[PDB]
Amino acid sequence: MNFVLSDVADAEAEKAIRDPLVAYNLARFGESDKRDLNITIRNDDNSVTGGLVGHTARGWLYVQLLFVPEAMRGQGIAPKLLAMAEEEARKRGCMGAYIDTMNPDALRTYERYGFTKIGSLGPLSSGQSITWLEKRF
Amino acid sequence: MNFVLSDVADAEAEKAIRDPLVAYNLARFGESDKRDLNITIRNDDNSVTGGLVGHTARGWLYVQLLFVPEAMRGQGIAPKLLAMAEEEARKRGCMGAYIDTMNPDALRTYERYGFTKIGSLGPLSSGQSITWLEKRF
C-alpha cells in the first residue's frame, strides 16, 4: 500500500476519499439531511454582489461564507442575512446555528446578533485568531 | 437590491460571494499562503482507497477529511496519516494543526495522537456532538 503526499488540488482523488467517508458516516450515524442554504444579494441586472453561503445538516445550520458589498456596510445587512438564514433553518426544523471567523468586526456582529463563543485558537501567522460560535434556537 | 434565498448548489453564485470575501481578507489580513495538503492511500493499480485531505493557511494545518479503508483499521493508519501531514506542515513552517469530528472513535484517536479539545457543540439531531481540537507544534 502506497502513501502519496501531494500539495495540488485533485477533484477525483478528493472524491475518492470523501465518498467512502460519507458512506461510512451514513451507515453509522444515519441520514445527514444535508441541504444547501444560500442567500444572494442581486442588483438590477441580476448580478450577485454578496450574500451568505451555508447549509443545514443533522439539525444545525452552518454559515460558511458571508460577504456584504462595500456600499452596503454599516446598514444591518450582515444581520439581515443571518436573520434570513435562521428563519429558513428554523423552518427546516433545526436546533441551532454555528459560525466561525478570524475577523474581529465579524465576531462583534455575530455576538450582537446572538451567537456565543464556543472556542478559539491562535494566533494565526498574521496575528488574528479563529473563533467558533453557536446560536441555539 | 434583491435578497434571494435558495436551497440548491450553484457554483457561479457561490464563487461570486467567495471571491470578493477572499479579496477583502487579503487586503485586510495579508496573504493566506493557502496550499493544499493531501495524502492518498493507493493500491497496486494506483486507485485511491483512503487518505487525508487538508491544507495549510496562515500558519496552521487544517485536516478536512480522513478515511481509513475497512481492511486497514486498528493498525495505526489514521495516526500515520496525521504524522505525515504534521511533518509536511512543520516543513511549511506551520505553528500548529486543527481538526474537527462528530465520531467518538476519531475523537479518541486524535486525543491519543496529541490534539487537545478547544470546544464543542451539540447534540446534533442524531445525538452526537461536534468537537474541535488543536495541536500546537
Fold and architecture overview:
In chain A, strands 2-3-4-5-7-6 form a 6-stranded mixed sheet, covered by helices on one side. Chain A is α+β, with helices and mostly antiparallel strands and 137 residues long. The first copy, chain A, is 32% helix and 36% strand. The N and C termini of chain A lie far apart (47 Å). Chain A has helices at 11-29, 77-91, 104-113; strands at 2-6, 35-42, 48-57, 60-67, 96-101, 116-121, 130-136. Chain A is built from 3 helices and 7 strands, in the order E-H-E-E-E-H-E-H-E-E. Chain A folds into 2 domains: 2-32, Single alpha-helices involved in coiled-coils or other helix-helix interfaces, CATH 1.20.5; 33-137, 3-Layer(aba) Sandwich (Aminopeptidase), CATH 3.40.630.30. Chains A, B: It holds the Pfam family Acetyltransf_1.
Number of strands of chain A: 7
Radius of gyration over C-alpha positions of chain A, nearest whole angstrom: 18 Å
Return the CATH class of the largest domain in chain A. Alpha Beta
Strand/helix succession of chain A = EHEEEHEHEE
CATH fold-level label of the largest domain in chain A: Aminopeptidase
State the assembly state of the protein chains.
homodimer
Class from helix and strand fractions of chain A: alpha+beta
Overall number of domains of chain A: 2
Biggest pleated-sheet summary of chain A: 6 strands, mixed
Report the sheet-strand fraction of chain A.
35-45%
As a percent range, the share of helical residues of chain A equals 25-40%
Count of helix runs of chain A: 3
Largest interface, with counts of residues having CB < 8 Å to the other chain, equals:
A-B, 70 and 70 residues
Outline of chain A, from the CA principal axes? globular
Order of strands, widest sheet of chain A: 2-3-4-5-7-6
Going by CATH, what is the homologous superfamily of the largest domain in chain A? Gcn5-related N-acetyltransferase (GNAT)
PDB class: transferase
Keywords: acetyltransferase, structural genomics, PSI, Protein Structure Initiative, transferase
Assembly: dimeric
Entry title: Crystal structure of putative acetyltransferase from Agrobacterium tumefaciens
